[PDB]
């Protein structure tokens, strides 16, 4: 098929892990996640995932998974990603029972952080869930992407015209509950009972929690998204600034404007041209080749890989 010629000019395919396949980028050898789309099948909802994909160009941050590459073809649209070694955050919440407050307080101080990003781009994700937050191969977290109900707000559920903002704080506060009890808040085998449950917003709170944790999480789970904490008012939290004393770092280090002289100089060379002209081109950022192989010659480093091409 024509639709993966250009794809097999760049990767090698390998296992399912939507489809979603496991591949390595031929230049650097660096293993990613491809994401493919097929056109036919999405119909009426392209335009919207092509207004997701451009969302995606604009977030680079530290706990969000990167877009390296974006590849459209007659009837298909590849996405590659980050492969993330260390699995979905539930998969690791299920190894350990539940969290203390402490490994809790650092997994969701990485949450809060993209969050906070994502919602600093004029974003709102809509869909927080264990199952798209993974660990890097550092054990980060990164962000990404009836069935998602459990983590849904109370307006979100109603039909009702939602904030985005107002909504993930609802679903950090389920996440935040999940980390720290290791069972969800609201819960119930029947659909009507578990909307109900939500809608009404009374929950378990197991002894093993403590006053601050019952607080933070009695703050984000309220039921009015008006009398819901902010985000503003959860970057410096007295739980969340509890031993560390400094507030969530929100802010992007991944810069789009800043290169890497090392990457740049292997670059210029394969491509026979000068460090000046290198610069302008990767700068473009047209999450072309170039930007995938810039980009993973960045990971490649970042683990001490050679950089050689
Ligand atoms: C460990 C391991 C392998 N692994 C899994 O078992 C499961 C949880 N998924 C989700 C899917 C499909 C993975 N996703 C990504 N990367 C990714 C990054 C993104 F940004 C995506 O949008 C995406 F779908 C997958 N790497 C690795 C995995």
């Not at 789970?221 to 008012?233: A, E, F, H, T, Y």
């Not at 400094?246 to 670059?267: A, G, M, R």
Request: proline share 4%; net charge negative.
């Amino acid at each position: 098929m024509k639709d993966y010629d250009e794809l097999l000019k760049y990767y090698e395919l390998h296992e399912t892990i939507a489809k979603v396949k496991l591949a390595c980028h031929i230049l650097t050898g660096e293993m990613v996640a491809i994401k493919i789309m097929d056109k036919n099948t999405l119909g009426s909802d392209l335009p919207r995932i092509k207004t997701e994909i451009e969302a995606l160009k604009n977030l680079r941050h530290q706990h969000i998974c990167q877009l390296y590459h974006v590849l459209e073809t007659a009837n298909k649209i590849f996405m590659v990603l980050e492969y993330c070694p260390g699995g979905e955050l539930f998969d690791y919440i299920i190894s350990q029972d539940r969290l203390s407050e402490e490994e809790t307080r650092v997994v969701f101080r990485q949450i809060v952080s993209a969050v906070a990003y994502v919602h600093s781009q004029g974003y709102a994700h809509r869909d927080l869930k264990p199952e798209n937050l993974l660990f890097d191969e550092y054990h980060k977290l990164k962000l990404i992407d009836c069935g998602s109900l459990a983590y849904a707000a109370p307006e979100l559920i109603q039909g009702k015209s939602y904030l985005g903002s107002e909504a993930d704080v609802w679903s950090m506060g389920i996440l935040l509950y999940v980390l720290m009890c290791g069972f969800l808040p609201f819960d119930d085998d029947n659909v009507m009972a578990l909307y109900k449950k939500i809608m009404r917003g009374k929950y378990d709170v197991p002894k093993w929690l403590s006053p601050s944790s019952i607080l933070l999480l009695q703050q984000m789970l309220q039921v009015d998204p008006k009398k819901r904490i902010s985000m503003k008012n959860l970057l410096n939290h007295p739980w969340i600034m509890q031993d560390y004393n400094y507030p969530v770092e929100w802010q992007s280090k991944n810069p789009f404007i800043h290169l890497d002289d090392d990457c740049v100089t292997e670059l210029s060379v394969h491509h026979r041209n000068n460090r000046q002209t290198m610069e302008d081109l990767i700068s473009l950022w047209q999450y072309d080749h170039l930007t995938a192989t810039y980009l993973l010659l960045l990971a490649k480093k970042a683990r001490g890989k050679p950089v050689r091409l």
